[PDB]
């Protein structure tokens, strides 16, 4: 029953075309609930959930102020890291930031995150002890020194450890009927012939929440994990997810392969077979 | 809520 509230920030520099583009997204569990785009004319933290619109105008006044201050901060780190790597000032560069907390089913703190990234690769991160950083390269050692001399990991401690836990346990009761639901998968199986002597078996899983599911193709006990397409858990778009696993079993050998589904919304794993 | 206005800058 562990729950998490994560915030994803994507600051992309566009030299010669205006200010860097900034996008901020927040997710309780896998349900987005806020949004911020530096191009949208609103220039405000826009709700994206029905259970988050019950927050007074002061919530959206503080939230907008605290996300634009991160937008302007990332607007000066892009120029700072550009010189740190000594790159040309006419190229596009991306700074990504993620943080949040993990709150158990008890409603208590489990783990706090803070992870930055420059150009897709890891840049710096916050260790599980919440007081030490893990620089990823030789340019991030300067940041790790600026963030230790100014106690960046100690001021941030009262947010991941205290503020995220208190504010995430506000969403899990406001969004009680949405975030705290487990919809079981609507599993089914299909046979698509490709040849007279070869065929494929597709094991489906539609409309399950949360997105964490496992589809496996065991052939008489042994789980294959070989020649088994396992496309990523894809969102249906209505707050649920979809996923399917395939296999290239030969014709006439259909009735020896089984599909097992282990979703937390299911009483026990399923044992889908053909027919 | 997003992190406040405390920090330094990379």
């Amino acid at each position, epitope marked *: 029953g562990s729950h998490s509230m994560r915030y994803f920030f994507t600051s992309v520099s566009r030299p010669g075309r205006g200010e860097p583009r900034f996008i901020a997204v927040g997710y309780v569990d896998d349900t987005q609930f806020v949004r911020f785009d530096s191009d949208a004319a609103s220039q405000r933290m826009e709700p994206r959930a029905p259970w988050i619109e019950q927050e007074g105008p002061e919530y959206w006044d503080q939230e907008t102020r605290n996300v634009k201050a991160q937008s302007q901060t990332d607007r000066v780190d892009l120029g700072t890291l550009r010189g740190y790597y000594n790159q040309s000032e006419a190229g596009s560069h991306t700074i990504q930031i993620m943080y949040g907390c993990d709150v158990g089913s008890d409603g208590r703190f489990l783990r706090g995150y803070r992870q930055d990234a420059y150009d897709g690769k890891d840049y710096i991160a916050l260790n599980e002890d919440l007081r030490s950083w893990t620089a990823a390269d030789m340019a991030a050692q300067i940041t790790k020194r600026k963030w230790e001399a100014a*106690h960046e990991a100690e001021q941030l401690r009262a947010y991941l*450890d*205290g503020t995220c836990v*208190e504010w995430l346990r*506000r969403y899990l009761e406001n969004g009680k009927e949405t975030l705290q639901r487990t919809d079981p998968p609507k599993t089914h199986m299909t046979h698509h012939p490709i040849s007279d002597h070869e065929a494929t078996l597709r094991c489906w899983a539609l409309g399950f929440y949360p997105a964490e599911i496992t589809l496996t193709w065991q052939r008489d006990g042994e789980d294959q994990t070989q020649d088994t397409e396992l496309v990523e858990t894809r969102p249906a778009g209505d707050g649920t997810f979809q996923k399917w696993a395939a296999v290239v079993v030969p014709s006439g050998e259909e009735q020896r392969y089984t599909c097992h589904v282990q979703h937390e919304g299911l009483p026990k794993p399923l044992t889908l077979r053909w027919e | 809520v997003v992190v406040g*206005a405390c920090g330094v800058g990379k």
Partner: antibody
Amino acid sequence: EVQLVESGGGLVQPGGSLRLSCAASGFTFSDYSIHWVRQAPGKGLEWVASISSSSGSTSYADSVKGRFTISADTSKNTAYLQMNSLRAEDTAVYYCARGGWIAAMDYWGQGTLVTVFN
Amino acid sequence: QMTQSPSSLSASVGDRVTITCRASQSVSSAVAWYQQKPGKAPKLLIYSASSLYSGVPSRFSGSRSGTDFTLTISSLQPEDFATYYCQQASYVRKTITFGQGTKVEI
């Protein structure tokens, strides 16, 4: 090393005005909160109001919610507490504290008696 | 709401005393313990409900059994007779709440 010195409280009539000043010294004032806590005579501690020197966030105790206003001058290391519409129950010893990054007021002042007298 | 129990407890030197604090809707992060000797500014002892503040003697220690926070003095000394307050902060409401206070006597 950190010293919090509070001053400016004394005898005042109900429905009057006071401005309690907490002169912090010993730390970067912009990085720590400054809380005002009052100790009613004989009774226990009661948190009154709060300020965040950077980002300018305030808070009040719902018993001094509309009456008190905290300000803070960053280049004076001095946080103020303006007390309006002072009631007979507002008399106490007012300590100014320091939110110390740990969700705890690690450094406290000394106290400033405020006597609302009719 | 939050009730600190008991409002007074008397024990001799060397005993083990436990002051409980019922922080129903509080995070473990924001629960701290203070010690106010009469007519003096309080003194932080525990923060985050278990972590000793630097300089505090190691006989103080906190814990949490469910929605209930405890301060334990392992071996009482003739300097630990004061009034003890537990705080709780609600980041949602932006309020620090101080417990009633437990007066440890002789």
